[PDB]
Design a protein around this ligand. Sequence first.
Ligand SMILES: NC(=O)c1ccc[n+]([C@@H]2O[C@H](COP(=O)([O-])OP(=O)(O)OC[C@H]3O[C@@H](n4cnc5c(N)ncnc54)[C@H](O)[C@@H]3O)[C@@H](O)[C@H]2O)c1
Ligand SMILES: [Mg+2]
Ligand SMILES: [Mg+2]
Ligand SMILES: [Mg+2]
Lengths: 181, 173, 419, 101, 121, 222, 188, 133
Amino acid sequence: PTDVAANISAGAMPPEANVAAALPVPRIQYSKWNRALRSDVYDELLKLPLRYKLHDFAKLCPPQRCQEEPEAVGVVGRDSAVGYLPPLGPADPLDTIPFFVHRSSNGVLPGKVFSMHPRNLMPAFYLRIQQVEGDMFRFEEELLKIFPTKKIFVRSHSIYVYNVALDGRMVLHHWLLGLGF
Amino acid sequence: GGFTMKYKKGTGLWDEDHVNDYKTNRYLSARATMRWYQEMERHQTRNSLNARRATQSHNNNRGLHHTGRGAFERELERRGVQVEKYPLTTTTGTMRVAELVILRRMELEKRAEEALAEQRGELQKKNPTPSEWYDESKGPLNPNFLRSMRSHYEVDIANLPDTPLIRGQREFF
Amino acid sequence: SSIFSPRYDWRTSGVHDIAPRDEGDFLYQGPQHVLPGAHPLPLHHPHNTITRPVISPYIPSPQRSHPYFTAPLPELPHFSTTKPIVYTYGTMKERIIAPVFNLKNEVIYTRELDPFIFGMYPEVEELSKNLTYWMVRCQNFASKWDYETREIWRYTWGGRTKPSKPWNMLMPTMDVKTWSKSNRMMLTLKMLQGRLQVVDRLTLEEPTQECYLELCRNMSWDVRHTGGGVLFMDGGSRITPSSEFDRAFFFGSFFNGRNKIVRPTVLCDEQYDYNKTAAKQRMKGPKGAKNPIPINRFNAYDAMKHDRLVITEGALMQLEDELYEHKLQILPPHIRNQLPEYGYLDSEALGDCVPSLKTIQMEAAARTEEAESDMYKSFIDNPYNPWKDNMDASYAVDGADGTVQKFVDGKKVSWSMLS
Amino acid sequence: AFRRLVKRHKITNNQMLLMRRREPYKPTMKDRQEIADRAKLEEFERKNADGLMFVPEKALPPWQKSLAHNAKALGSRINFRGFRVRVADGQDEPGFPTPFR
Amino acid sequence: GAFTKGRRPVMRQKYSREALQAALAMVPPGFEVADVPRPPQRILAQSEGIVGRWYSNYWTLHSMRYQCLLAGVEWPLGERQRPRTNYDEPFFFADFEESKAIRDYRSRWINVNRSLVGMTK
Amino acid sequence: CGHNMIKMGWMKIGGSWKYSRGYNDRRGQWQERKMTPRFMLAPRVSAGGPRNRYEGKLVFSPLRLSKLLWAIDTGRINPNEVITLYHLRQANVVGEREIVWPGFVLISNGVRRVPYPIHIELQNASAESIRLIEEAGGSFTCVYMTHEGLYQELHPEEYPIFMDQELPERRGLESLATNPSKRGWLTRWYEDSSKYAHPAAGRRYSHYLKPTLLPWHSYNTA
Amino acid sequence: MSGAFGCGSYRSVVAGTQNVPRRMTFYPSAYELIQLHKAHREVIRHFYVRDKIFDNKFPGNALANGLFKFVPNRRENYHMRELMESIRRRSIWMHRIKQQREINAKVVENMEVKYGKKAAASMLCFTTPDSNAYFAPHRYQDVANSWPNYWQHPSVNHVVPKPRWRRHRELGGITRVEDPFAVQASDY
Amino acid sequence: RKARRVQLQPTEYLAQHRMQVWQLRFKEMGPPFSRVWVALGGKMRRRRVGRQVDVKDMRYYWRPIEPQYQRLYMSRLRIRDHSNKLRQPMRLRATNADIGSGSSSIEWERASNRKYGAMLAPPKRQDFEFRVV
RNA sequence: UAUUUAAAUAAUAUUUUAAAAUUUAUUGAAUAAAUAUAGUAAGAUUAUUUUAGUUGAAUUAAUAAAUAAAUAUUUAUUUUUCUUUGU
Ligand SMILES: NC(=O)c1ccc[n+]([C@@H]2O[C@H](COP(=O)([O-])OP(=O)(O)OC[C@H]3O[C@@H](n4cnc5c(N)ncnc54)[C@H](O)[C@@H]3O)[C@@H](O)[C@H]2O)c1
Ligand SMILES: [Mg+2]
Ligand SMILES: [Mg+2]
Ligand SMILES: [Mg+2]
């Protein structure tokens, strides 16, 4: 959290950082078709206290090795540009996760960000997860531990988290992948 | 008139498919159900026979045969040459197919019944006592189902004690 | 009146007679007295086992996930599911085996069900969607006609400005996805309540009604109006399944009581609307789907109104065959990429496996196709081998004509389109 | 008197009958209007305390980003430094030296 | 769309291979497809099937040309248009209607090549 | 159950209808007091207007290369066969609603490296997508089709025998069909100069490069 | 124009794109098999619809039993429009799947000749823990809780309050519970 | 007895409210939830010959319109399907998704024409023997 | 030209009585049609016991200037401080 513009004005940084003060750092954006994992937010999730152990980012990221292979085959884990990988499963085998999160038909995660009263083009957004199976309340409590200040409702079909954007949907997807779903 | 999906009308497996029916009711008695089936079959037959009568009358007024084949096609039929490029299966053929399928199904039913009765005799002579399903550890049994299953065993089943008899705590008979 | 209203309790006397009856009234003995109908949970329908008999291996208990069996009985022949079993997002995740019955009220063998069909745990939202659609579709839309001021000729007699009209009324459109989901959830609710019965055949010795009544009496089927109703799903049998109903039973099932026979399907046709913008003025009928669902389909309303649900093994086979591709498409990719590995997608069209069991009508149609396939040999539009000369062709881009043409051995094969 | 149906609040204390205005501690209409005006002016002065920082072509409003990009995409094909396209629309000149400048 | 011949079939009779050869037998010698012109837009596009003088009907003629192509029957008549690829006899032709000079293969071949070499974008 | 009365909120039925204006509204002048029409203040940039979709504007539908790679890694599309609009529509990677002439544009959004060669046929692919596919080793071929050609590609079963398909228009030819940068499908035919000498020699042939389906079989296991 | 069979279309042929030696990758063709199953079902259904026969069970409409439910002209149009196209689509799917099966066999042979029998068997396997979950949940009860009714999962089965039930005969074979109720709160 | 009976009322045009005046003057820009209607700046006025001799002042720049006018125009688009708040307002210019959905409905699954932008694509090459009486 | 993240594809309707004579015809000023339309004069518009914001402001026709204000519906920012504060 450094104000590059304020630092340049005060003289603490070189004046060539105006592009950094104006435009954010270019990074491949996380999308429903391009799982661009963010190591910083994944490290933040690893540092946050949670009951369930998450896999390492080395295993979450698809392998990047030499591509001298003449013909490709159907390995479960192969080189992919969009970063698609099958669910790895739990981190510690001697545990029981109270909930189960199914993927969609295209392998995308359940996180979908909607808007409240979208006819008026309202900027207020909310997130809906309608693929969680098992104990929905344990998932809701984990979402409470993730987003402390947000309003989280639960029903038989969907879990709603209010006032969270794609910036929160990506964190939810990161936590789901780290858990192994 | 206007546009209406005549290509969709008549495509469903049954007659009640693809028909705009907005005059029914949420509860239908026996006579109501009979009249509903009657009206559907009658609507289908009316459409079909009216179309056939119209096209046959138009053909006969134009001077062609009631089928629509002209003098050239009639002369070809006289010669014996096949007139249709793709001869479709006819009513007699379709009915024969249905008949032979029904007959094969009946024969398979007879053979399956024989084999199933043999296996029933084997399993009944093997197991005289109820297996682990006759347990009360989780829930109470159903007297109707017990009376139905009575015939498969030698010992009476419907005789149920007031206590939730479990396999391990007490021996059964 | 309303609960929080002053008019709610101004009838402070006279509602009851001080003297009690001498035949039905009695005094409360104490805590050891069993009152008729007393129950701690609010049960608007206090029906019990004796009044509404349930037919299942066990009485539905909180310990048991489902009242039916969990493992095949070693003293009864076990019949696996026609199509392989897959557990989807909503399946019960547990094996379900139903004790198929015979026309003599005797258990014949035990057949495994499908969790995708009879394991999709029910949900009130989908059940209510189904019920609301059915109750809003079944109403008569031709009787909603009303007068108007321009239709009244000489206020009391002058009609309203915007009256109800058969065309102005709405008939909603429901998608096959939600329809199948609600039907499956209703089937699972019936299974959980333990009122589902699987019979081999539904056939009467005579097409009359007294034989139907004798059958119902012999197998303890309550058909009276006051008693619990019956909902049949006739499909033939296990060996000879049929999409149509048995003729004898379909003629005999016309009884004044509460018994309804429905088609052996849970899906529906995709409802179309060709008058969405009110183009055709002379159209009579409600706006919306012009292809509604017929009455003889399975539905939440009739399933709730009829106590017992008697499905036939032919109906089971047809439902499984109709839901196979759907429960295969729903699967995520890292799961569906393994179906040919485990042998789930062995299609008999390629010759991998012998053709599987089909219904009478579908088998007849398939044999008709097999016999008619001989005529598509000496023609270039053969459907079984379309465009059989591409790799041996030569495409030429004639610029003077501005067209790309397909020549073979120096002769034009492409056909110029006529206008 | 813009709203002609006054709200009736629940009377918890008898002095709520004698009071006329709902929020007495709140400043009146014109006073709070000029107060908000002065606050917005102070915030704008705090924002413009430092010099007007210039932004690259990507961090521009949509009605200027695409124009500024297409005005130089022709020269962007040939990678050579010292190529400027003096476009009409853009950030105006502040008129004084700026640390960001 | 239903009046004119646009994307719509006009002959609903599909004959066998032997029936097409019998239909082509009644064709008189000395006939050519180029003789029958395309009817105007103000004429209904209907076909009476294989009847007397069927080759005179424009839609029936070419529809019979399409079915024999599928069945593999050698079309005895010529083609609708004969392209002039090489300069041969007759080296000059007479036309009082300015249609033969425009519909020539060589006349439009140089025009397309004019537009191809004219592109300079 | 209530009336949404403007400037008054939600009122019960039978309440005060005195100060009501929503009725007259359902049945600004202070901004138009100075005779300042917004539709007449600003001038028109052109007679057709900005972003006027005229015939030939070539407004493509976006197709993300990241989406395509995701589909291929998922298994909807088989990378062995050549990718075409028909294969896309059948694999249901793109719904039928997004299809409109001209077919699609291959946009390379959020992709920096393609690990495997992809052989795809689309229209007006971006330069970055083309160069990424070339680097990976796949071969892209810009297939700019006419309307009837696109319909035949999407529904080939309606056409038992190949038919004479008209060449694209002049703008399409000069933009995509004969553009070497976009890897058009007529660039080689346009570069061939022998067709300009003699009309009989103008016809250029092309052949396929080289390295029944009856569902009923016999019970050979016995 | 053969863009359905998977090879390059006539446009690519004219362009001269060298895409024949492209690659040989293993592919399960599960989606293609699903679509082939759908197309086969649709072909059978189209044939059954085309071969419909009037079967009237009522005497009023009894004068149609021998006729087809279609007018022969519309029957021919249906056969030429939909029944004949479903077979072409089925053939397209079959051809694509057969080409992919040939390529799969070639890839299997290549892996067997390069790495080995068990190596290829492990490289061409897609089994995952979630696959074991989807195919057999009894081998997955320990790993995670995936039941719609989580309160009845054996991991959380302790929460279900199993009551002391007994079947009384004086009531007519009625199952009741023995434990007493709880005194509910009434007022403040 | 019998009088003038009322029939079904035809609906209005689906794109009746969007005006060519707006489509010519303004254009929509920005992300979906922050769309702005922008028109080119400057003062349009006809004056006599010899005025505004210098062209460097006349600039071609786009400036957004007043938010109240933007809200009014957007509401004019929002008039259609008002009861469904889950449906985003229409667009100033029709898009590819709109042109596709115009025929992607199941009631148009049989019509070969009107599909895949038939009205948008240029016409086919007419026949050479084409003529009209 | 395309190196930036989403989405529950659904349209149909929108007070009432009236504020005016021209219309289209017929029979020797009446007769029968017109929910035709009035920048729209005026009124009537069916349902208690309720649960949170302002009570006289805003007002710049027209080139590169941070912003109109009230009323009402939804909806969002828990940072310091001696207490308070509807942004
Ligand atoms: N716009 C179009 O012209 C269009 C559109 C879709 C499909 N097609 C297909 O193009 C082909 C030729 O079209 P056209 O306009 O040149 O002629 P056409 O379709 O107008 O006439 C073709 C003639 O051959 C018959 N025919 C069609 N398919 C046949 C088959 N499979 N076997 C035997 N006879 C058959 C027709 O009934 C008619 O007699 C046909 O297969 C047609 O269905 C054309
Ligand atoms: Mg307009
Ligand atoms: Mg506004
Ligand atoms: Mg406010």
